[PDB]
Amino acid sequence: KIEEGKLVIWINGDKGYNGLAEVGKKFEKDTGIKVTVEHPDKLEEKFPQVAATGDGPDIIFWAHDRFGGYAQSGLLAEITPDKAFQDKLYPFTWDAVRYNGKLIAYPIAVEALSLIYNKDLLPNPPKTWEEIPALDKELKAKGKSALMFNLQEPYFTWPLIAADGGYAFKYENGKYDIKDVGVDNAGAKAGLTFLVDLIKNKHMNADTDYSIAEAAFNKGETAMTINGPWAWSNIDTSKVNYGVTVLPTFKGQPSKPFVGVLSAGINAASPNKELAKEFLENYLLTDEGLEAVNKDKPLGAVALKSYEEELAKDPRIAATMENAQKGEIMPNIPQMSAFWYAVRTAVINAASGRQTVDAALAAAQTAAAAAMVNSPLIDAVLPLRSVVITLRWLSPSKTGFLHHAGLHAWVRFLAGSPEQFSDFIVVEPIENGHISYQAGDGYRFRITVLNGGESLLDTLFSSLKRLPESAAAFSDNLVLEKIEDTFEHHQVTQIEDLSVFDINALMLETAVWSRQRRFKVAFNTPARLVKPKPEDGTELKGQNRYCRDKSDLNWQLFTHRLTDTFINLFQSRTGERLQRQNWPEAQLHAGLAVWLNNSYTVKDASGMLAQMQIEIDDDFPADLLALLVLGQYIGMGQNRAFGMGQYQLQDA
Numbered sequence: 001k002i003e004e005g006k007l008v009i010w011i012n013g014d015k016g017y018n019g020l021a022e023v024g025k026k027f028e029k030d031t032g033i034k035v036t037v038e039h040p041d042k043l044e045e046k047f048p049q050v051a052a053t054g055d056g057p058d059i060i061f062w063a064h065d066r067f068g069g070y071a072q073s074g075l076l077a078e079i080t081p082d083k084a085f086q087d088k089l090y091p092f093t094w095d096a097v098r099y100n101g102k103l104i105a106y107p108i109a110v111e112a113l114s115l116i117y118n119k120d121l122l123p124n125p126p127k128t129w130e131e132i133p134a135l136d137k138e139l140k141a142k143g144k145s146a147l148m149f150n151l152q153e154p155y156f157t158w159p160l161i162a163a164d165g166g167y168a169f170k171y172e173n174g175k176y177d178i179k180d181v182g183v184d185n186a187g188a189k190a191g192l193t194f195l196v197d198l199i200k201n202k203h204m205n206a207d208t209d210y211s212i213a214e215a216a217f218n219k220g221e222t223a224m225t226i227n228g229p230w231a232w233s234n235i236d237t238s239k240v241n242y243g244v245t246v247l248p249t250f251k252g253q254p255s256k257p258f259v260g261v262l263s264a265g266i267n268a269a270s271p272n273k274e275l276a277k278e279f280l281e282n283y284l285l286t287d288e289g290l291e292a293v294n295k296d297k298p299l300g301a302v303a304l305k306s307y308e309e310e311l312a313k314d315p316r317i318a319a320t321m322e323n324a325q326k327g328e329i330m331p332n333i334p335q336m337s338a339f340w341y342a343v344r345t346a347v348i349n350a351a352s353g354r355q356t357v358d359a360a361l362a363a364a365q366t367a368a369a370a371a372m373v374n375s376p377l378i379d380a381v382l383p384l385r386s387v388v389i390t391l392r393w394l395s396p397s398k399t400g401f402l403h404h405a406g407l408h409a410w411v412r413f414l415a416g417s418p419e420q421f422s423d424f425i426v427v428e429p430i431e432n433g434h435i436s437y438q439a440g441d442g443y444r445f446r447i448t449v450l451n452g453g454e455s456l457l458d459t460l461f462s463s464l465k466r467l468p469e470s471a472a473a474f475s476d477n478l479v480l481e482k483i484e485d486t487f488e489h490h491q492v493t494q495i496e497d498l499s500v501f502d503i504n505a506l507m508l509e510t511a512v513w514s515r516q517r518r519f520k521v522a523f524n525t526p527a528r529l530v531k532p533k534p535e536d537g538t539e540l541k542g543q544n545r546y547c548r549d550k551s552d553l554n555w556q557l558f559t560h561r562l563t564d565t566f567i568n569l570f571q572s573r574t575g576e577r578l579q580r581q582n583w584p585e586a587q588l589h590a591g592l593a594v595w596l597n598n599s600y601t602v603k604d605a606s607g608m609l610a611q612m613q614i615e616i617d618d619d620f621p622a623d624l625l626a627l628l629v630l631g632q633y634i635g636m637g638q639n640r641a642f643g644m645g646q647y648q649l650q651d652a
């Protein structure tokens with residue numbers, strides 16, 4: 001949980017976090033409240049992961065475009081500055097942090113990309129993108145290059161894509177039309193194609209990221225870069241004579257950067273809300289606070305009127321606002337994360353040659369418009385990680401006798417014998433039944449790790465790597481051959497190498513089953529689904545407690561048990577037990593249903609195998625369909641952590 005009496009702050013590593021820490025040291029001097037300023041990697045994705053369960057920082061610093069989604073998920077508290085304080089900051093910056101009428105963050109600064117160029121290598125910067133290829137040939141003759149900027153984040157490529165007609169969502173009548181995405185019109189195609197032709201003609205490198213581009217410019221190797229005001233600090237250090245100017249035009253149109261408002265949100269689960277307000281209103285959002293941060297890494301055009309009226313005299317800040325005006329302030333709607341994931345994939349795939357520009361942007365238009373999912377039940381379990389582990393026997397042995405219960409206890413032991421094992425790890429063995437193995441034979445099983453289970457996965461990796469010594473069937477007669485990433489189907493050695501099944505992958509998969517409205521639900525391993533509680537007060541006993549006939553299965557029973565699983569996972573993570581709503585009605589017809597008996601001299605292994613046809617409405621809630629899709633990867637019913645209750649969605 002978040003510790004009361006102190007303040008923990010998250011801000012991106014490219015920002016002036018040391019400056020921010022000095023503002024925190026002054027706060028601690030005046031109130032005794034310790035202020036810890038951290039800068040995690042991928043924090044815009046890390047915040048929902050930890051905040052969904054009640055952890056994370058007291059204050060989060062990011063551009064405003066992520067905050068509507070945070071607010072929609074109930075991660076942010078409503079800030080309450082009086083009218084006197086609101087007048088100190090620009091009204092349009094307050095607009096950027098408003099969501100459904102409520103202010104959800106304190107605006108800090110307005111960030112916009114500008115063209116940064118080496119005045120010594122390039123006295124007159126190019127006014128148009130079309131000049132850059134010709135310019136690069138001349139510079140390559142001196143062993144230099146024209147332009148290098150981060151091609152891994154669509155933030156940096158969007159000004160070009162938007163120049164000739166690209167847009168995120170059409171805005172009319174106070175509303176963004178999610179179904180009207182503009183990443184796939186003639187102008188977006190022209191912009192990305194020009195980017196790809198730069199790479200194809202050796203004027204840029206598809207691999208270029210933020211570090212490579214910053215290093216090249218600051219070491220005098222490239223004449224131009226594209227970055228924001230935070231980057232200026234490192235350039236002053238490198239003693240490059242640089243300037244900040246307007247972005248080049250494309251087809252006569254100016255480049256249109258998506259402008260962000262760096263904002264500070266207050267975690268909804270923070271017990272230090274009043275302290276957070278005092279730090280932000282009375283210490284950071286003052287002339288001396290922002291200056292301490294600006295001195296470390298320049299903020300840009302700050303939202304505080306009194307300070308910005310002095311900074312605007314800086315020609316670099318003026319250029320920042322010039323590019324900003326030629327662009328647009330980002331929407332803060334929850335769909336922005338769907339947009340940025342779509343365009344990130346589009347630009348990487350097009351630039352790497354994997355997809356054509358037309359195909360890459362066609363998929364991005366579909367992806368950007370996919371129905372969001374902001375469920376607390378889902379944010380608690382995502383992201384998933386999964387591995388298939390291959391062992392080799394060191395002497396003969398028998399498996400299947402305990403019906404994979406020994407494997408479970410063994411993996412639990414190898415994970416540190418932790419508390420709440422079943423709430424974070426699912427153990428799915430290969431369904432062989434009874435097998436006798438010889439020395440040298442392989443043994444394979446899959447384990448899926450839910451959000452909050454990395455340390456368990458780390459202990460597991462170490463134990464496996466130290467077999468057979470680790471163990472002290474499934475004893476110290478096994479050795480690790482390899483660990484494969486279930487989702488990439490290739491080998492890994494450290495946890496950091498593992499891919500994730502995250503919210504964006506789930507939204508894309510859910511959309512597939514949204515459009516195909518009829519589909520089948522089939523159990524791979526038997527399910528132990530308890531029958532509904534008799535309404536006359538009596539309790540069911542014995543094997544009569546569980547569903548086993550076609551007549552026992554219906555749409556409400558199935559979705560109740562599925563949701564029970566998610567509620568339990570949520571409860572054990574947070575302590576709260578959410579109230580269980582009923583799903584909208586749908587057609588569910590059980591085609592096949594039979595009960596398997598798997599008792600061994602204990603009946604835990606027995607369960608029901610079933611196939612169900614589903615039909616859903618056009619307007620069926622996506623965040624519920626998403627529970628159905630996610631349930632494929634975590635299983636439902638009793639003993640789901642032993643691999644029971646595994647189902648998969650198939651087409652009819």
Ligand SMILES: OC[C@H]1O[C@H](O[C@H]2[C@H](O)[C@@H](O)[C@@H](O)O[C@@H]2CO)[C@H](O)[C@@H](O)[C@@H]1O
Nearest residue numbers: 012014063065066153154155156260340
């Ligand atoms: O590239 C997608 C990414 O763009 C923006 O992130 C910016 C951020 O606004 C700046 O403060 C700075 O850190 O550069 C980031 C790009 O790496 C959006 O704010 C973000 O939502 C989006 O995913």
